[PDB]
Amino acid sequence: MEMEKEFEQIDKSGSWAAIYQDIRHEASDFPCRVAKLPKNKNRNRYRDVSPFDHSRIKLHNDYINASLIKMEEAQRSYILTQGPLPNTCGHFWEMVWEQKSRGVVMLNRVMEKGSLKCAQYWPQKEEKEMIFEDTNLKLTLISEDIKSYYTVRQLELENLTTQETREILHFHYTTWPDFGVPESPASFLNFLFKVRESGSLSPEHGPVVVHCSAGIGRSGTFCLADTCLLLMDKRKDPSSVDIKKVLLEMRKFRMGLIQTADQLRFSYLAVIEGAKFIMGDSSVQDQWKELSHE
Ligand SMILES: COc1ccc(-c2ccccc2)cc1N1CC(=O)NS1(=O)=O
Ligand SMILES: [Cl-]
Ligand SMILES: [Cl-]
Ligand SMILES: [Cl-]
Numbered sequence: 133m134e135m136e137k138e139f140e141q142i143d144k145s146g147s148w149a150a151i152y153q154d155i156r157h158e159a160s161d162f163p164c165r166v167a168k169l170p171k172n173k174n175r176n177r178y179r180d181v182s183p184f185d186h187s188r189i190k191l192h193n194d195y196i197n198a199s200l201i202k203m204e205e206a207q208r209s210y211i212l213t214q215g216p217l218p219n220t221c222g223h224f225w226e227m228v229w230e231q232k233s234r235g236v237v238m239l240n241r242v243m244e245k246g247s248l249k250c251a252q253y254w255p256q257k258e259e260k261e262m263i264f265e266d267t268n269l270k271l272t273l274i275s276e277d278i279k280s281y282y283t284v285r286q287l288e289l290e291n292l293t294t295q296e297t298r299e300i301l302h303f304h305y306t307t308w309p310d311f312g313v314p315e316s317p318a319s320f321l322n323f324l325f326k327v328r329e330s331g332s333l334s335p336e337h338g339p340v341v342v343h344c345s346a347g348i349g350r351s352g353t354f355c356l357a358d359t360c361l362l363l364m365d366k367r368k369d370p371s372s373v374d375i376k377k378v379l380l381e382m383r384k385f386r387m388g389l390i391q392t393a394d395q396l397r398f399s400y401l402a403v404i405e406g407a408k409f410i411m412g413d414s415s416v417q418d419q420w421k422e423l424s425h426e
């Protein structure tokens with residue numbers, strides 16, 4: 133694969149920083165007029181992380197800090213959003229409901245570096261459901277499966293207006309530090325494939341909702357890897373994937389995707405290693421499971 137040749141050349145010349153900064157300089161710039169309106173100040177976690185108008189998710193005030201990353205060639209969509217705020221947990225679950233998502237991928241912890249980077253937007257106990265009065269939704273913890281570095285939750289979301297009920301799967305990576313990277317390619321891919329195996333990325337469901345704290349760094353890394361693997365999967369041709377071009381394509385839909393050079397570097401590693409599975413190595417998934425120490 134060309135990505136592996138290019139990774140070798142970037143490593144040898146120690147130029148991940150320059151390569152990553154070139155991507156930032158070339159990244160699309162689009163207006164975020166709605167996000168910046170005064171009435172939406174308290175709906176944004178970070179003043180400088182906004183959804184572009186053209187790709188933003190509208191609630192059915194229609195504003196949420198969330199973007200539809202619509203990957204035409206790969207035929208997969210993701211919604212990337214910030215970690216919900218205390219006043220936007222209702223909006224968040226409303227979006228899940230309206231967009232018909234089946235999975236939420238959370239790549240952060242509620243507390244990071246002493247600070248609250250995400251609201252407690254799901255119930256931690258079966259007998260303590262959450263009711264969101266503004267959006268008329270009820271959220272119940274049904275079960276959870278806790279592993280050493282991630283947790284999967286079965287949630288029940290009820291639209292109280294219609295009394296319809298849906299099952300939402302919550303995939304919570306708990307050891308991915310802000311501005312950092314997963315422990316190994318194996319941990320990351322073990323997690324990614326857990327999401328894939330649930331059905332949550334199927335085109336029969338709405339786009340998976342992915343978030344971290346700002347919904348760009350770790351959320352970006354996750355989606356870049358998944359898309360690159362899907363592209364080579366559809367063509368069965370690892371060598372045809374250009375990672376930097378795919379990342380630039382994603383950045384047309386939301387700003388700042390992948391926040392450090394090392395996250396970009398890690399994405400190459402994950403994609404090169406995931407390629408083994410795509411192209412028919414049937415022992416590698418169990419290797420990843422074992423190496424992840426779940
Ligand atoms: C704690 O995580 C973050 C905090 C602030 C910003 C940020 C804020 C303003 C401008 C650019 C980035 C970005 C992050 N992220 C780092 C990260 O790795 N993922 S993230 O999008 O949650
Ligand atoms: Cl947490
Ligand atoms: Cl802490
Ligand atoms: Cl918060």
Ligand code: NA
Pocket residue numbers: 186187
């Ligand atoms: Na458009």
